[PDB]
A paper describes a structure:
As an inhibitor of RNase E, RraA has widespread effects on transcript levels in E. coli, although its physiological role in ribonuclease regulation is debated. Surprisingly, in vitro RraA does not inhibit the catalytic activity of RNase E directly, but appears to act indirectly by occluding RNA binding regions in the C-terminal domain of the ribonuclease. We have previously shown that RraA can directly interact with RhlB, and it is possible that RraA plays two distinct roles in modulating the degradosome, by inhibiting both its ribonuclease and helicase activities. We present biochemical and structural data to characterize the interaction between RraA and SrmB, and provide structural data on the interaction of RhlB with RraA and compare the two complexes.
Author numbering:
A (entry chain C), B (entry chain B), C (entry chain A): 2 to 159
D (entry chain D): 219 to 388
Amino acid sequence: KYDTSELCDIYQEDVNVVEPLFSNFGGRASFGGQIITVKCFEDNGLLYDLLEQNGRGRVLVVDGGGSVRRALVDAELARLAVQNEWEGLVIYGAVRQVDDLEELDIGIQAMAAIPVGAAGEGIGESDVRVNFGGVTFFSGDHLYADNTGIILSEDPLD
Amino acid sequence: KYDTSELCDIYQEDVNVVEPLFSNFGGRASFGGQIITVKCFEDNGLLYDLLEQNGRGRVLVVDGGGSVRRALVDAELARLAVQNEWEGLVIYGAVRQVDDLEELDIGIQAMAAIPVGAAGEGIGESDVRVNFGGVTFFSGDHLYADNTGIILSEDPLD
Amino acid sequence: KYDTSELCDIYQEDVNVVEPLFSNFGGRASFGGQIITVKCFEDNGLLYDLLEQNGRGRVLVVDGGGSVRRALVDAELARLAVQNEWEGLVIYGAVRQVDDLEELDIGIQAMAAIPVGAAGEGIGESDVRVNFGGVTFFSGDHLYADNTGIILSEDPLD
Amino acid sequence: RKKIHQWYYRADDLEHKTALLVHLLKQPEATRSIVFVRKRERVHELANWLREAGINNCYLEGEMVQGKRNEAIKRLTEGRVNVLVATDVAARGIDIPDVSHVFNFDMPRSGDTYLHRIGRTARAGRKGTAISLVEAHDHLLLGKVGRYIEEPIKARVIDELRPKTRAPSE
């Protein structure tokens, strides 16, 4: 239960709203938590590393360069996230096997769908500011998202 | 009730077609009626004054400037549209509470969703000619919309 | 019934991936076949000639020049394809009467809906090399599509 | 790009339209003809219709297992037969040799289809003939096609067999 439009009405300026660039791909329509950011590009070695870890109460915010040439998340990687209790994923990038994703009990917001997987090298960086859709993200910020859009605050809400 | 493709077959050049920039957010797949125009930007004071009146058989057509930073129509105001029996709304701009809007017995075509609501000051004009999507709009005209698109005519069709 | 991601994972670079420009409008979530190609522009007289023939195991691939001004396929012409058992249609163009197209056992991917139909002068050429989405199609290539994307190879797959 | 003699006859009835072909096939000129049709069903019949008239006609329609598709094709390149009936699909990946006549029993919507049909005739050199038979429901289609292609198809009339109703509006 998160209403991003209700939240905007309440906290006003104290939230930042992300551009309307994304769409729901996961099993949850609304979701939120405390983010951990990632910078990468057409690679998801790092994603496999972090999602192998536990994430109750946590969202993974991934700056993927905006690529839609290569998918960063497939069913395997999302099944991974779900068994480790992750609230959801925000991918400034592409995703994959959308039919499988709608079924998994995780929020997924990304930009498009492309059949090609990313590479598995591991070239990237985590816990770093990322920036996209007109908003800055640091690890330990809080993120709230549903079908209407995505909002972000530095403190927790409710 | 309405199939816009058949209508175009039948009426050919007596009909102008809007460009495919819009989508349905309301419960009604297709709707149609006599139109009242409103011009504004990121403010919906006018919309409240307008949707309080009754509007059976009427459609509200909003040049919202195309802005997607601030949402012109939330759940609150859609209800007041249903209450006063309005056929449907057309917004060159953004809406809000997408999940609430699809449960509502009205028609809603718009460009995008953004969780930030519009100001309420009242700034705007109504019953003026407006232009977007390559169709030009006067109050008194007739709009029919379904999932395929939106079309306009001077005189009522059928 | 087909999984474009698993295929890319297997065939790697023996497939070519179309850019994510299209979406599903038909009743079949995925599909695949031998392609027959057409280059045409806001006209479908030739698509009626082709789809009147039998196409079990076949996909019609149409370079409609990317136009969203004019619908190349509408329910009529979709019922006709279905009747002749055509696997699915890929249209670099617009489609029409979406509510009717979704209830049909055929795969259709296309760029947008617009309610105005194409002309039927018969102008167009067929079995020609065509280009769009970063891929070149020619008759006898094999296309496979789902809700994640479109892929194409020279030889069948599995 | 190639060049072929092209004619058409308008018809009143399906029945007329098929006597027209019958007559036109019984000509010494006719040598190896292919006749196109539109509907699946009409391939079977028109083939019957043809024998009776006294013309060995062989019928080829697009489900046929590829073996049959060769047994059909082999009869034609053998003097056994000089008429093939088919549809646009039914004959898609085939080269047949030394054809001299292509007939459009049903008119196509597009000049692209038209051009592939009459593309069948030879190039041996010696120059084939494409003849369309037009029922009044095909008239528009005959014009649309004509405009597609450089030029219109000149009309003809068989003295004995003759259209007992008027030509359509425009």
